Amino acid sequence: LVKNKCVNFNFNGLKGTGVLTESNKKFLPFQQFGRDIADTTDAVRDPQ
């Protein structure tokens, strides 16, 4: 897991590019990834 750096990533099939910076957030145990108001994935959960 490459943190704090601009990388390409693939979480379970959610492919994307950006910087991962360990958001606090409150994901319900079943919730895999989050989304902003514009329906763009702004948070993910590590499957490891």
């Binding site: 409150k26 994901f27 319900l28 919730q31 989050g34």
Partner: peptide
Amino acid sequence: AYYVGYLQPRTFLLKYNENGTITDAVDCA
């Protein structure tokens, strides 16, 4: 004592709080 209801195709407006919890819904039709 058990209750049974049936699902139908519908549009719902669900409200999420800051914790990601669905706290209310509106049945559009």
